[PDB]
Symmetry: C3
C-alpha cells in the first residue's frame, strides 16, 4: 500500500497531492502500531479510527517485535517513558527496520530531564527513523544544539532560524524533521517547507501533538517519501482542526476535542485541496 | 446483591427480564473490579459510572486479591498485557473464585500474537470463569480450531456457524460464551441465544468491546445466572448504542462516543422492554 | 510564580480572593507534575490545560526527581499504585521538598485494601505535604492508626463529624486537609471552612476527584498559603461544575464531562466572585 503520490520532478509537494495521500489512508486503512505515553493512548486510538486507520497498542517486549513487523508504520512516543518501555521501543524499532516498516519518533519533553534527552538519543542511535516530530525546543535538545543557543528557540519568531534548525537537524540525522509551532517547518536533507494550517485550540487538548505524530505514521504507511507523507499528514490534520474550531471555538476545549475527532472522519479530499497551505522554501 | 431475575422454568430469557436486571444494577451499584488495558481504562470507568455501577481498577500483586474479594464482579482484559499483569490477573481471579465473585474474561487479540493466545489460555487454565466475551476469531483460536465448517464462498455469514462455535466452546470450557460482532451469539452448556441490538458506529470507538465486557460484569454482579446476566447486559448496551446513534446522526464518531455514555445513563427499563431483541435458538 | 493573594489579617478567605487566584493560575500557567493513576491521566491533563495550567506526567525513578524540582507543584495519586510507583512518588516528593515545590496527595481508595492504606501512610511519613485531598472515609482510614485516635461520636454516617475529622487530621498531620462530599470541608491547624459549590453529576465522571486534586496543585503553585489555595481551587472548580451542569443536567454524564472541560476554560473572575460560597466555621 506504500505508493508514490508525488515527486519533485513535477513541482513542489502541494494541496492536491496531500489530498491524494488522505484518500489512500482511507482506502488502505493502514495498521499503525503506537508505543506511546499513557496520557494519550485512548485519544490516539480514537483519532486514528476516526481518520480511517487501524490502531494497535502493544507494549510488551514479549510481543512488540511481532506486532511491528506486520504494521504499516511504527510510532514511538516517550511522553511517560520508563526503562522498560524504552527497551520495547528499540526492540520494536529494530524489527520495523528489518522489515521495512517506517518508524516515527515523538521526543516529548526531550530537554526537560536528562533521562528523556538521553532516551531520545538512544532510540535515534539504535533505530533508523523515517521522521521525528516535535516542538523546536525538543528537537534542539535531541539533536544536541549547544545549551546556550537553545534560548534562540524561545518566544515566537521565524523567517530563517527555525527553518535552518530543521534542515540542519535533518542533515545531521539523515531523516525528516518536522517542527510544529505557530508555523510548522518540515525538512529532509535537501528540501524545506513551511505549513500554515491548524488552530491555537490544539494547544488546549492533551495529545493533540501525540496524535498528530501517529497520523504522520498512518500517512507514512501509504506514501514512500516521508517528507511528502508528513506534509500531507500535518496539512490534513490542520484543516480538520480549523474545521473543528469553526464549530466550537466559542464553546471551549472540551467541545473542540470531540469535534476534532468528528472532523478527522468527515474531512474530505476537497477540503484539503481547498484549504491546505503548503509553501516550498527556497534553499540555497 | 446478586439474585435471580429469571428462571428457565419461567420461559426463555426475554427483554422483560433484561430490563429488570438493568434496574437491579442501578439499585445496587455493584463494585466492578477491572484489570484492563491502558487504552480503555478511562472509557471503561466512565461507562460503568454512567450505567450506574461503581468501577475500581487495581493491578498490583500486593492488592489484587484483596480488592477482588470485596468486589461484586472481576473483569480481566488482556488488551495491553504484560507478563506481570497476567500474573496479577490470575492472582485476582483465584481470590474471586474462592470468595464466590464472578470472573469475566475479554481475550482481546487472542490469535494475533502467540503471547496473547497463550495468556488467555493460562487464565482459563487457572481461573473458573463465569463468562467470556470476544469476537469469533478470538474465541475460536483460544479454544483451538476443531470444527472448521461454516460456509463456502463469500455469500452470507450464515449464523449457524457462529452458534455452533459458541455452544461448543461453552461446553468445552464449561462457561458462558458471548460472541459479539455482526452476528451476536450467547450460549452456555445447554442454551443458545442470538441478540440483535447494535450499530456499526461502535467499531469507531476504541474500547467499545472492552466496556461491553465490563457491563457484562456489572450484570453478573446482580444476576446469579451468567447466561441471563450476559444477555441482559448486551441487550441493554445495544439499545443504548442504538439510541446514541439516533441522537448522533451524521455528527461523527466523537459525538457518538459521548452520546453512548449519555444513553447508558438515560436508557430506561421501558426502553429495554421495548427495543431489546432476544432470540432463543432451537438447536437439536 | 508562587505569591500570596490573601492574608487572614484581611479577614477570612472569600470569593473575591478565590477569583484572584484563578486569574493568577491563568497568568502563570504553572507546570503541574502529576504521578497519578492510569484511569484519569487524559482527563487530568485536559482539565489542567482547559483551566490554564501546564500538565506534565513523569513516573520513572530515573527522572521524577529532575521533573519535580522544575515544577510549580507535585501531585501524588495512588488510584492504581504499584510498589514501583509508590517508590517513585516518594523520590519525587523528597526532591520537591528540597526545592520548595508544594506537594499534594490524593489517597485514593485508602482503607479499601491494606496496601493502599499503608502506601498512603508511607508517603505522608517520607514527604512534607502541602495538602491532602480525599473523601471522608479515605482520610479517616489514613489517619486512624487506632480506632480511638480521632475523637468523636460513633454513629450512622457522618457530617458534623467531618468538620471535627478535618480539624483533628490537620492537627495530627500538620497540613491542609480537604475532604470533599455533598458539603466540602477544608482545614489547617488553625482554621476551618466549608464550601458549597458543584453538582452531583461529578460523581458520574471518573477522575472528577483526581482532577480536583490536580487543580488544588495548580493553585498551590501560585498562592503560598495552601489553605487559601485549596479553597480557591475547590471553589473555582465547583462553580465551573455548576455552570456545566446547568447546561448538561438532562443530557447525561458524557455531555457533562465535556462541558466541565469547557467551563474550566470559560469560567471567569466575575463568575467565581458571584457564585463561590465560602464559609468560615466559627470554631473555638
Ligand atoms: C503533557 C504530557 N506529559 C507527559 S505526556 C503529555 C501528553 C502530550 O500532549
Ligand atoms: C486499540 C487498542 N489497543 C489495545 S486494546 C485496544 C482497544 C480495542 O478496541
Ligand atoms: C474508580 C477508580 N479506580 C482506581 S483509580 C479510580 C479513579 C478515581 O476516580
Ligand atoms: Cl499505564
Amino acid at each position: 500500500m506504500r505508493g508514490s503520490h508525488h515527486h519533485h520532478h513535477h513541482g513542489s509537494m502541494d494541496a492536491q497531492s496531500a489530498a491524494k495521500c488522505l484518500t489512500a489512508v482511507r482506502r488502505h486503512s493502514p495498521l499503525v502500531h503506537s508505543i506511546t505515553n499513557n496520557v494519550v493512548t485512548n485519544f490516539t486510538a480514537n483519532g486514528l479510527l476516526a481518520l480511517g486507520a487501524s490502531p494497535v497498542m502493544a507494549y510488551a517486549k514479549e510481543e512488540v517485535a511481532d506486532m511491528a513487523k506486520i504494521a504499516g508504520a511504527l510510532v514511538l512516543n516517550i511522553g511517560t517513558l520508563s526503562k522498560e518501555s524504552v527497551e520495547a521501543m528499540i526492540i520494536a524499532g529494530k524489527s520495523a527496520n528489518e522489515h521495512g516498516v517506517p518508524v516515527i519518533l515523538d521526543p516529548v519533553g526531550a530537554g526537560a530531564t536528562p533521562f528523556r534527552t538521553e532516551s531520545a538519543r538512544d532510540i535515534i542511535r539504535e533505530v533508523r527513523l523515517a521522521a521525528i516530530r516535535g516542538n523546536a525546543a525538543e528537537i534542539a535538545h535531541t539533536v544536541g544544539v549547544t545549551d546556550w543557543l537553545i534560548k534562540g528557540v524561545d518566544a515566537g519568531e521565524g523567517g530563517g532560524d527555525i527553518i535552518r534548525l530543521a534542515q540542519q537537524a535533518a542533515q545531521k540525522l539523515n531523516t525528516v524533521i518536522a517542527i510544529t509551532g505557530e508555523v510548522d517547518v518540515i525538512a529532509d536533507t535537501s528540501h524545506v517547507y513551511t505549513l500554515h494550517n491548524g488552530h491555537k485550540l490544539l494547544t488546549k487538548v492533551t495529545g493533540a501533538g501525540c496524535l498528530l505524530t501517529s497520523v504522520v505514521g498512518a500517512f507514512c504507511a501509504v506514501e514512500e517519501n516521508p517528507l511528502f507523507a508528513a506534509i500531507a499528514a500535518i496539512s490534513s490534520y490542520g484543516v480538520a482542526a480549523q474545521l473543528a474550531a469553526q464549530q466550537t471555538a466559542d464553546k471551549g476545549p472540551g467541545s473542540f476535542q470531540i469535534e476534532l475527532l468528528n472532523k478527522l472522519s468527515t474531512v474530505t479530499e476537497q477540503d484539503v485541496q481547498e484549504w491546505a497551505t503548503i509553501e516550498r522554501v527556497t534553499v540555497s
